[PDB]
RNA sequence: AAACUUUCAACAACGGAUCUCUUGGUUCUGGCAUCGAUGAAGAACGCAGCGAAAUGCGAUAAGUAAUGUGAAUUGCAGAAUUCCGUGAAUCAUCGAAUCUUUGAACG
RNA sequence: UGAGCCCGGGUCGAACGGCCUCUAGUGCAGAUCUUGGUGGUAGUAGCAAAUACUUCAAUGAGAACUUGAAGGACCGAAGUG
RNA sequence: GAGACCGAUAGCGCACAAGUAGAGUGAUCGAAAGAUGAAAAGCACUUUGAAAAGAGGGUUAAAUAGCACGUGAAAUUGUUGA
């Protein structure tokens, strides 16, 4: 559904839309992986 | 054109048969004043206009 | 080339217009001649330009002085000759209108004014 | 000044871009555009605990 | 110290007013002391400097050079005195600027206007000398 | 285009006047900090 | 182009369809200003211009808005 | 103020140049090829670089640079022909040769005791 | 052995930190009340001997009158000022004027 | 012990320090920190299509891409007018 | 008129021809940029070079103050020495 675009290469430091023409996009980082792991652990330890 | 014709006659005693005008790109007007055949432009320019 | 304002105040209207005509005629002939040999003639241009301004400011000032004498005892003056002040101060009530009091107030101040007194210690 | 450091229009670019989550000046024709603002760590920003 | 509230002892306000002064105020600032002979003659200590004055330089590298003032350059707060000059590279003689506080006036250019200036200063000195005395 | 008004013509006259560089004698004035036209 | 030269504020912000200036509102008698933008207010407040008349009022207040001519003047 | 201050200017001849629009890396290797050389041999070498007869050995700034047989004189394999750097170094050498002529030194015994290429502000 | 890579020193580069300065800002306090149809605030175009901008001014246009001071302005050129004078000045004060096109804008 | 303190040598040119108290916008390696500057990568990747250029002379410090003349190509009136 | 304030990345965005330059159709957004010297005395003259510039010579107390101008750190670079 959504297209995951990396913040690497020609996509580092872009304020807006990258060159991937899609209706919905999500940009991801290394620093998200720390946060997503923390959010997953908090969900696993509270469910 | 009428004001240039009167000013040349009243001040410098210069008769004109035709006056042409353009506005230069600087925003200033340039007037071409052709004289009557009786007078000479070289005589008037040397006498009054101070031009060789 | 420079006229003196002290000389111009003594002269009358016909002499002032003749001098103004002379300066304009002198400037116009020398403006067609300033196209070449721009030297001390340029100082003559600047002096003549200031001289015309001096004759114009004394022609206008004497005319305004005569009009003020004409309108000395007239109810309405031209708007140029009226004092300027501010817009608020021209719509402010006059000194005689602001100081006007009712005659019942004037009678009370006539017979019972504020007195001068002292209290011992 | 109570308005010192707050006279700018800045928004965070986002959380997915490989840049720090600090508000940045919008625009695009200036040196100031894209620069961090509204922080005690930032040049031309707002210092911590403004003096009252 | 200062007493009156209209006076200011601010350093920046004093420096702003000095370097942004009009030429009329700059004339009073560029004043020079009178010589001992002239001081006992007019009972006047100092006067604003003048184009025709004759001065002697008592401070700087051109000490004891005596000459006539030639220019009062009020823009750079300097006076030009005759023959106190330096040479450029091209062998052209250019004048050296001396502050009026470093010179002493040894002769005055006297007109009717200066004579009122000496008179008005002299009147106040003997006014207080009589006030201090009797 | 080829068709203009005089007021538009005078505005374009002023536009090139700002693009003119500064004169050399301004740089030689005492207390001058101007270097070039901007 | 959707905007032309306004005649009151001099900006190229006069709509060619609505004929209303987006910066000042020229056909309106009042000049457009809003309190949610202090930046826009300081860009057009008094002091941003030349002050032909308002710079001469304080000197005339100091001497009491006096008329006439000093005595003995030529 | 030159870098080599141990050499007195009275017995020496010097010439410098600033903000020269030549590649810094090519000029560094060209100045290293002629360091400590005689004046007339260096001028002949630099002209041969222009005419592609002798080559300048590239030692530090020689990444992915081609090989040639003219580097065998220098004991290397990567050697190039910096024509633009050779033109600038000729004019500076002719300038210092003129400075020695004016001062009265002998041009036949002049060696390049010091030569340095420094980085200029970037355009 | 040289070259290359690395370490230290010296000098020279790149760069603009530190130090010192400040006609600026920030905050507090005190005296006073003063925009405009007699055309405001703002916008434009012109004006200097040699000026683009900032500044000043408005075809009397880097300004006129009047008053005061009392001999300059200055980057250059040129006059000045007879200097024992209605009197220099990019001077100050300021009670008289001039005041282009618009803009509440008003054939 | 240590955070640090003090002196010698060079540079530089206008203000600075010890001691006891008072006061604070007071001590940094990190924050994908802010601003500014600088590297390796690296003299590396690369500097396209529109077929095509050549000879003599002139100018100039310097001429493949500046000019004149002469050869060879092209737009082909729905033009590269 | 003042300050137990800040001292050019600080203090107002603006110590400077700053709401300027620039960006956007527009509402609007909006910088960077201070310091030679006491005095320009800001290199006469000679020489090389097409020129830019360089070397002599000169100004200054100081050219280790050349309007790429006070002091001139580190990153990074060059030459020489080990
Ligand atoms: Zn408008």
From TrEMBL, chain A:
It is found in: Nucleus, Nucleolus. Residues 1-22 are annotated as: Disordered. Signal peptide: none annotated. It comes from the Eukaryota. Belongs to the class I-like SAM-binding methyltransferase superfamily. RNA methyltransferase RlmE family. SPB1 subfamily. This is Uncharacterized protein. It comes from Chaetomium thermophilum (strain DSM 1495 / CBS 144.50 / IMI 039719). The lineage of its organism: Eukaryota, Fungi, Dikarya, Ascomycota, Pezizomycotina.
TrEMBL record, chain C:
It is found in: Endoplasmic reticulum membrane. Belongs to the STT3 family. Catalytic subunit of the oligosaccharyl transferase (OST) complex that catalyzes the initial transfer of a defined glycan (Glc(3)Man(9)GlcNAc(2) in eukaryotes) from the lipid carrier dolichol-pyrophosphate to an asparagine residue within an Asn-X-Ser/Thr consensus motif in nascent polypeptide chains, the first step in protein N-glycosylation. N-glycosylation occurs cotranslationally and the complex associates with the Sec61 complex at the channel-forming translocon complex that mediates protein translocation across the endoplasmic reticulum (ER). This is Dolichyl-diphosphooligosaccharide--protein glycosyltransferase subunit STT3. It comes from Chaetomium thermophilum (strain DSM 1495 / CBS 144.50 / IMI 039719). The lineage of its organism: Eukaryota, Fungi, Dikarya, Ascomycota, Pezizomycotina. The chain holds residues 5 to 125 of 935 of the full protein.
Automatic annotation (TrEMBL), chain F:
GO terms for molecular function: structural constituent of ribosome. GO terms for biological process: translation. The chain holds residues 2 to 39 of 51 of the full protein. It comes from the Eukaryota. GO terms for cellular component: cytosolic large ribosomal subunit; preribosome. This is Large ribosomal subunit protein eL39. Signal peptide: none annotated. Belongs to the eukaryotic ribosomal protein eL39 family. Keywords: Ribonucleoprotein, Ribosomal protein.
From TrEMBL, chain G:
One of its GO terms (molecular function) is rRNA binding. The keyword Transmembrane does not apply. One of its GO terms (cellular component) is cytosolic large ribosomal subunit. GO terms for biological process: translation. Keywords: Metal-binding, Ribonucleoprotein, Ribosomal protein, RNA-binding, rRNA-binding, Zinc, Zinc-finger. The chain holds residues 14 to 87 of 95 of the full protein. Signal peptide: none annotated. Belongs to the eukaryotic ribosomal protein eL37 family. Zn(2+) binds at residues 6, 9, 21, 24. It comes from the Eukaryota. Residues 62-74 are annotated as: Disordered. Component of the large ribosomal subunit. The ribosome is a large ribonucleoprotein complex responsible for the synthesis of proteins in the cell. Transmembrane segments: none annotated. This is Ribosomal protein L37.
């Amino acid at each position: 559904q959504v297209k995951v675009v990396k913040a690497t290469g020609a996509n580092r430091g872009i304020k807006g839309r990258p060159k991937g023409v899609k209706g919905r996009y999500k940009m991801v980082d290394g620093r998200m992986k720390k946060e997503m792991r923390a959010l997953k652990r908090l969900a696993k330890k509270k469910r | 054109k009428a004001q240039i014709k009167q000013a040349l006659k009243k001040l410098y005693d210069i008769d004109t048969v035709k006056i042409n005008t353009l506005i230069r790109p600087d925003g200033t007007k340039k007037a071409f004043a052709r004289l009557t055949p009786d007078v000479d432009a070289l005589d008037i320019a040397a006498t009054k206009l101070g031009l060789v | 080339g420079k006229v003196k304002a002290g000389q111009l105040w003594s002269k009358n209207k016909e002499e002032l217009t003749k001098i103004l005509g002379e300066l304009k005629t002198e400037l116009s002939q020398l403006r067609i001649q300033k196209i070449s040999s721009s030297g001390a003639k340029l100082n003559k241009i600047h002096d003549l330009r200031k001289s015309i301004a001096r004759v114009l400011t004394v022609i206008n000032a004497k005319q305004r002085a005569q009009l003020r004498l004409f309108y000395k005892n007239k109810k309405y003056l031209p708007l140029d000759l009226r004092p300027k002040l501010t817009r608020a101060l021209r719509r402010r009530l006059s000194k005689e209108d602001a100081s006007r009091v009712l005659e019942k107030t004037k009678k009370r101040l006539t017979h019972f004014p504020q007195r001068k007194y002292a209290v011992k210690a | 000044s109570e308005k010192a450091g707050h006279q700018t229009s800045a928004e965070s670019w986002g959380t997915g871009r490989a840049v720090a989550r600090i508000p940045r000046v919008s625009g695009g024709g200036t040196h100031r555009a894209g620069q961090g603002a509204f922080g005690n760590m930032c040049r031309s920003g707002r210092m911590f605990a403004p003096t009252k | 110290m200062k007493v009156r509230p209209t006076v200011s002892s601010s350093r920046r306000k004093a420096r702003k007013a000095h370097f942004s002064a009009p030429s009329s105020v700059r004339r009073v600032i560029m004043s020079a002391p009178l010589s001992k002979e002239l001081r006992e003659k007019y009972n006047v200590r100092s006067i604003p400097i003048r184009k025709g004055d004759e001065v002697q330089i008592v401070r700087g590298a051109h000490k004891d050079k005596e000459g006539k003032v030639t220019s009062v350059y009020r823009l750079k707060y300097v006076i030009h005195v005759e023959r106190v000059t330096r040479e450029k590279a091209t062998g052209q003689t250019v004048p050296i600027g001396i502050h009026p506080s470093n010179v002493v006036i040894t002769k005055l250019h006297l007109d009717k206007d200066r004579e009122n200036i000496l008179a008005r200063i002299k009147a106040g000195r003997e006014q207080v000398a009589k006030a201090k005395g009797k | 285009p080829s068709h203009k008004t005089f007021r538009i013509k005078q505005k374009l006259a002023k536009a090139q006047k700002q693009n003119r560089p500064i004169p050399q004698w301004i740089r030689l004035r005492t207390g001058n900090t101007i270097r070039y036209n901007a | 182009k959707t905007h032309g030269l306004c005649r009151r504020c001099g900006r190229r912000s006069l709509h060619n369809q609505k004929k209303v200036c987006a910066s000042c509102g020229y056909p309106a008698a009042k000049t457009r200003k809003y309190n949610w933008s202090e930046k826009a207010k300081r860009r057009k407040v008094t002091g941003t211009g030349r002050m032909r008349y308002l710079s001469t009022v304080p000197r005339r207040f100091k001497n009491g808005f006096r008329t006439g001519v000093p005595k003995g003047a030529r | 103020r030159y870098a080599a201050t141990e050499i007195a200017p009275t017995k020496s001849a010097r010439a410098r140049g600033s903000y020269l629009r030549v590649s810094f890396k090519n000029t560094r290797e060209t100045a290293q090829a002629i360091n400590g050389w005689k004046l007339q041999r260096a001028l002949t070498f630099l002209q041969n670089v222009i005419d592609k007869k002798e080559a300048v050995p590239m030692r530090r700034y020689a990444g992915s640079t081609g090989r040639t047989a003219q580097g065998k004189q220098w004991g290397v394999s990567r050697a190039r022909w910096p024509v633009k750097s050779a033109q600038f170094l000729i004019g500076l050498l002719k300038n210092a040769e003129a400075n020695a002529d004016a001062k009265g030194l002998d041009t036949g015994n002049l060696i390049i005791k010091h030569i340095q290429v420094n980085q200029a502000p970037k355009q």
